[PDB]
Amino acid sequence: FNITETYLRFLEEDTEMTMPIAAIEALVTLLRIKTPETAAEMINTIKSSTEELIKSIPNSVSLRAGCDIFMRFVLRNLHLYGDWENCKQHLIENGQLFVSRAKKSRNKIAEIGVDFIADDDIILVHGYSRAVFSLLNHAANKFIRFRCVVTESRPSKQGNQLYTLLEQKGIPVTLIVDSAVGAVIDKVDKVFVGAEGVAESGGIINLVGTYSVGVLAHNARKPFYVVTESHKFVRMFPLSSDDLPMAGPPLDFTRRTDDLEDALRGPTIDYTAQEYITALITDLGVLTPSAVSEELIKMWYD
Amino acid sequence: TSHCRFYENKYPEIDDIVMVNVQQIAEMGAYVKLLEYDNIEGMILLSELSRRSIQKLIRVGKNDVAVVLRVDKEKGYIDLSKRRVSSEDIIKCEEKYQKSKTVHSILRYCAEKFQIPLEELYKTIAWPLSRKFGHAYEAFKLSIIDE
Amino acid sequence: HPNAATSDVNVTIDTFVAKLKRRQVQGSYAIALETLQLLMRFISAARWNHVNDLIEQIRDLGNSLEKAHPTAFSCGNVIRRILAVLRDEVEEDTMSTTVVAEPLISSMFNLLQKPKTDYRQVAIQGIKDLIDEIKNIDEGIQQIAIDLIHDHEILLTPTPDSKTVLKFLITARERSNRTFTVLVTEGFPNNTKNAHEFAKKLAQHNIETLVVPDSAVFALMSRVGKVIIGTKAVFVNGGTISSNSGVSSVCECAREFRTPVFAVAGLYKLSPLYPFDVEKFVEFGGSQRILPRMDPRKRLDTVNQITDYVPPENIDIYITNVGGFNPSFIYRIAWDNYKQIDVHL
Amino acid sequence: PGISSVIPTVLEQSFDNSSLISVKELLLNKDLIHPSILLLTSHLAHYKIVGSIPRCIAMLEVFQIVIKDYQTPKGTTLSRNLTSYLSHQIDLLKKARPLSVTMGNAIRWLKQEISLIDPSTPDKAAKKDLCEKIGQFAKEKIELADQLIIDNASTQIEESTTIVTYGSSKVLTELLLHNAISLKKNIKVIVVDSRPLFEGRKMAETLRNAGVNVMYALITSLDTIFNDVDYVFLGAHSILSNGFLYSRAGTAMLAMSAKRRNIPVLVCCESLKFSQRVQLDSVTFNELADPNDLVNIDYENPVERRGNKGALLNQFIKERKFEKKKLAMENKPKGNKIGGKKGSEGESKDASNEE
């Protein structure tokens, strides 16, 4: 029936219905066809389909995290030794209810996390996430004053994409390069960052220059933010500053070339430590440091 | 070679009681092997093996007590349950496992001496002893007193 | 819900409202005691028979109480504390009226799995236990705190206003095996009088007293062993609102010199609220106490603030009646006493 | 009853928080104490191998021997003079060497087991089940848990890597031995050592016996060896409520350098190692030892020289004081590998409430 093909069908779609929540919805559809009653026939084939999904992954982490939560919920269903049919019906229904929960959480956060942006504050935003931009839009809906500074992120020219999406709202902006980002931290009140993953330790899994932002802000004593939806938690512990799951290059040094083809290669995903984050915002209340780990301990029961 | 099932058919049924030697842990539950019904894998889930923290409990140790829930009689997929077995039945599960272990020990000298497959020797014994008499342990106790 | 129903039966609501607004009531410890006696009067007098209608009414009363006074966090916390004590016993009661409920530990994840009696008596005793907890905090502090400070070590202290901290310091000085020098920042616009009484009580017990002007803090930081905070209110992220003046700079001075920072507090003083902005939470003072004459005060726009905030980046320990905790853990202590819903009243 | 008071060397003007004394050579004692305790106390007084982890394992086995040797009196029941006898053991252990955290959790477990079993069951049937339970308890919490630490570390360490270590921690010796033999990688292991005990020397010796590429160094020379180093493993003793690393001597120095020089510190630990006592500096509660171990002039433990130093009591202020157990600062370590898999030291007490 395929799961990778179902995820590939979301091209012109996206937004509101997030990338992990679309992968979880694809997991439920694959589950509900071939009988969820048998725990031997099904769970092994679910594990093989997740393994096939990881093998097809080029540069994504959150899909592996979203599978875990699904699994957990499935196992927790028949924890009460209930009817092997009513528990199954509740499991299949919690697929559309999972995607509906992405709406309710966004409704919660955009009313909680507007409080952090005070009267007339200049913001420097880096790493686009659906939660952080939803804060930015629903604060403009609240009729509050805020200035915005665009960071020139270089994965697939994300800065320009961010700049255009800010233009469609009615908030004054200008381009700032990630090289010169050090020269901005004095006229900026607060620095906001949207995450691709949050660590077991309390650190962050993010894009092509976020650790660099974290350190500079720690030097300038100016606050550093993480805002996300509560599903991007893996049991991952990057021990060092440059160690991450990759399908591509971990810093390659190429031979002598004249035609100029082999060059670009640099760490596209970078880690930052727990100390650099001043504040974290999710739908699971207002909490930052060890909170993430408590969540993970609460899930894994280990 | 150590193979062939203790009973007549390859795959178990519903409500029948078995004894497992743990070979796996965490995530799902445990893809393992049995000591009551064949040597192939039969999986269980963490919830079943808990009832009642857990990081000191099983961890592929000795033997437990489990009852078969779901059997696939097509390719080979077995589901079990630990909690469901009652305290009075646990003693009966242990005695059947002890009986199965004695039958397996009996049908191993035969394969060693004459250098013939164990599965053929297990098949020729399990027709009057296991099916008609009741069990192979009590039939062996009858044979030693008076053949 | 308004106070139209509770007027002849309950009068003390409005007298507490009057005590807050005009600041007749003073010190978080006292504000808590009053709200306890308010909730004592609310249960003893009212007639409800229904439980869910009762709890939501209490929520609205607490919502109005915090809107009446924003700096009364001890007011807000005490209500929230009883609210959670109520909610657990109701959830225990609903399990018996319907008829595993014990997975492993007491976690969170309220987004995963779904769901006449002596309840009022439990509510009564729940208030009584809160009082006794607020009555005795010092006993729970001294067993953790008087283990960390050494002989010949110099202690610098902002906020001499706290009754809690001074009594912690006197129990340590009672130990003849422990010797320490005390530096006290004055905190000019507000703390002055309290700082002078602080210096008097230290001399009364014969402890090496040193009165410090708020300018001289830097001129001593090389010699300072430890820093102690007399906080009013503690938060989720770790940070504190303290009892007025000259703390933030001292903490900044300590961190640059890498001098350790201590904080003495209670769990009732601890708040489940989050300080997203200091701009809203901090209360400002009266500039009258700075500069005389009003015709120059047209041009002399003077700035003075009472309450001072410290970010969590500085302090390391919050020694309570329970024990010593790190700012990166204090949120759990909070959630052990207050529920997630019991925040936005 | 025992020997108390009258101590060698000066009382000292600075650092006088703990006892500096005790019985090395056996003279004047009670004639009821079990000899396996008397052996362990004589061992730990001048021990070269042990460091937190192995001390408790030996303490458990000694207890198992005592229970096996224990025959219940006809008049007095099982819970009558046992707990007094155990209190005599701990007091003799305290006189020899200050106890670890893991030792305390063992005693607490044993005292819980005394209360659990009521004097009504037969004597031989009781102790047979008791020692079986202790054996299973030691299997789970130590041996199996250790194996869990092994595999958790195995995924974390990259292929062909340089590791700098310190101490004589049982968990790390087995870790590196597992790396050299089972996984077969290019592991360059550098070991550091202090003056009071040649703990790292012994570790390096055992690694050499396995056949490992080993460099051996000292604290004095570090700004040369580092300028190479990737992951640094530290031998845990106890992690407190805050998340401070209470460990051996030359630990914090290494921890500082690693934080400064990019590639950080990792710590392997046991679920039994965590305490609830908290502190912030090394002065608080230090494991002090007699300057008799620092008399020797370099090279080895027994050399016996007519050197430069000799006097301590008669000399007008000459405090040659050394410490054994120190505190690493909170932020500097990054990983902790325990029974419950993983977690940063910022989290710390997510195991104490989980029990």
Q: Give me the domains of chain B, ranges plus CATH numbers.
A: 16-88 (2.40.50.140), 89-147 (1.10.150.190)
CA distance B19 to A175: 68
- Under DSSP, is residue C37 helix (H, G, I), strand (E, B) or coil? helix
- Under DSSP, is residue D232 helix (H, G, I), strand (E, B) or coil? strand
Task: Dig out the tokens for C218 from the structure.
Answer: 């830097």
Contact residues, B window 64-103, toward D, CB-based 8 Å cutoff:
none
Considering only the beta carbons, identify the residue of C144, C150, C317 that sits closest to D283.
C150
Beta-strand ranges (E) seen in chain C are: 153-157, 180-185, 209-212, 226-229, 231-234, 240-242, 261-264, 308-310, 317-319, 324-325
Asked if B59 is an interface residue toward chain D (Cβ–Cβ < 8 A), one would say yes
Considering only the beta carbons, identify the residue of A200, A241, A274 that sits closest to D342.
A200
Asked if D141 is an interface residue toward chain B (Cβ–Cβ < 8 A), one would say yes
A197 beta partners: A205
Q: How was this structure determined?
A: cryo-EM
Q: Which of C285, C290, C289 is nearest to C304 (CA)?
A: C285
- With a CB cutoff of 8 Å and minimum separation 6, the contacts of C288 are none
DSSP element (H, E) containing A298: helix A291-300
Return phi, psi of residue A11, to 5°: -115, -60
Domain(s) labelled CATH 1.20.120.420 in chain C stretch across 9-135
CB C307 within 8 Å of CB C241: yes
C interface with A, Cβ–Cβ < 8 A, is: 100, 103-105, 107-109, 111-113, 236-237, 274, 276-277, 279-280, 327-329, 331-332, 340, 343
Asked if D337 is an interface residue toward chain B (Cβ–Cβ < 8 A), one would say no
C144: chain D residues, CB-CB within 8 Å? 278
Q: Which of D154, D158, D156, D148 is nearest to D179 (CA)?
A: D154
Asked if C146 is an interface residue toward chain D (Cβ–Cβ < 8 A), one would say no
3-state helix, strand, coil in chain C (%, to 5): 45, 10, 45
Instruction: Please give the single-letter amino acid code of residue B135.
Output: H
In angstroms, what is the resolution? 4.2
Considering only the beta carbons, identify the residue of D241, D284, D353 that sits closest to C324.
D241
* CATH homologous superfamily, domain C137-336: Translation initiation factor eif-2b; domain 2 (3.40.50.10470)
How many degrees, rounded to 5, is the angle at CA C82 between CA C76 and CA C86? 140
CB A241 within 8 Å of CB A202: no
C-alpha D153, offset from chain centre: 20
CA distance A155 to A127: 10
Q: Which of D280, D286, D347 to mutate to test the interface with C (most CBs of C within 10 A)?
A: D280
D163 beta partners: D189, D231
CB C306 within 8 Å of CB C244: yes
CA distance D204 to D168: 9
Q: Does C102 contact B53 at a Cβ distance shorter than 8 Å?
A: no
D338 beta partners: D341
Q: Which of D315, D309, D272, D277 is nearest to D294 (CA)?
A: D309
Would residue C266 be called left, alpha or beta, if left means φ above 0 and alpha means ψ between -120 and 50 degrees?
beta
- For C9-135, CATH gives 1.20.120.420
- Under DSSP, is residue A75 helix (H, G, I), strand (E, B) or coil? helix
Measured in angstroms, the CA of A6 and the nearest CA of chain B are apart by 25
CB B22 within 8 Å of CB B32: yes
CA distance C59 to C343: 10
Considering only the beta carbons, identify the residue of D156, D346, D347 that sits closest to A239.
D156
Task: Dig out the tokens for D275 from the structure.
Answer: 């305490």
Q: Which of D342, D340, D186 is nearest to D267 (CA)?
A: D342
Boundaries of every domain in chain D: 11-148, 149-355
Task: Dig out the tokens for A16 from the structure.
Answer: 């509101």
- With a CB cutoff of 8 Å and minimum separation 6, the contacts of D121 are none
Asked if B125 is an interface residue toward chain A (Cβ–Cβ < 8 A), one would say no
* CATH homologous superfamily, domain A103-299: Translation initiation factor eif-2b; domain 2 (3.40.50.10470)
- With a CB cutoff of 8 Å and minimum separation 6, the contacts of C71 are C283, C307
D149: chain B residues, CB-CB within 8 Å? none
Chain B contact partners (≥3 CB pairs within 8 A): A, C, D
How buried is A140 (Cβ within 10 angstroms: 0-12 exposed, 13-18 middle, 19+ buried)?
A: middle
Task: Dig out the tokens for B96 from the structure.
Answer: 């059947």
CB D271 within 8 Å of CB D145: yes
Task: Dig out the tokens for A172 from the structure.
Answer: 């004054």
Instruction: Please give the single-letter amino acid code of residue A261.
Output: E
Q: Which of B46, B49, B52 to mutate to test the interface with C (most CBs of C within 10 A)?
A: B52
D347: chain A residues, CB-CB within 8 Å? 201-202, 290, 293-294
Count of Cβ atoms closer than 10 Å to residue A218 Cβ: 17
Measured in angstroms, the CA of B29 and the nearest CA of chain D are apart by 17
Q: In which residue are the tokens 């950080």 written?
A: D264
Q: What is the dihedral of CA B136, B139, B145, B146, to 10 degrees?
A: -140
- Please report the DSSP string for D100-156 in residue order: PHHHHHHHHHHHHHHHHS-TTS-HHHHHHHHHHHHHHHHIIIIIIHHHHHHHHHHHH
- Under DSSP, is residue D334 helix (H, G, I), strand (E, B) or coil? strand
CA distance D332 to D266: 9
B58: chain D residues, CB-CB within 8 Å? none
Q: Is the Cα torsion angle A284, A286, A288, A294 positive or negative in sign?
A: negative
- With a CB cutoff of 8 Å and minimum separation 6, the contacts of C293 are none
Q: Is the Cα torsion angle A69, A70, A71, A76 positive or negative in sign?
A: positive
CA distance A208 to D263: 20
Q: Is the Cα torsion angle D120, D123, D126, D131 positive or negative in sign?
A: positive
CA distance B5 to D197: 59
Task: Tell me which chain B residue has its CA closest to the CA of residue C100.
Answer: B51
CA distance D245 to D273: 11
Q: Does D339 contact B56 at a Cβ distance shorter than 8 Å?
A: yes
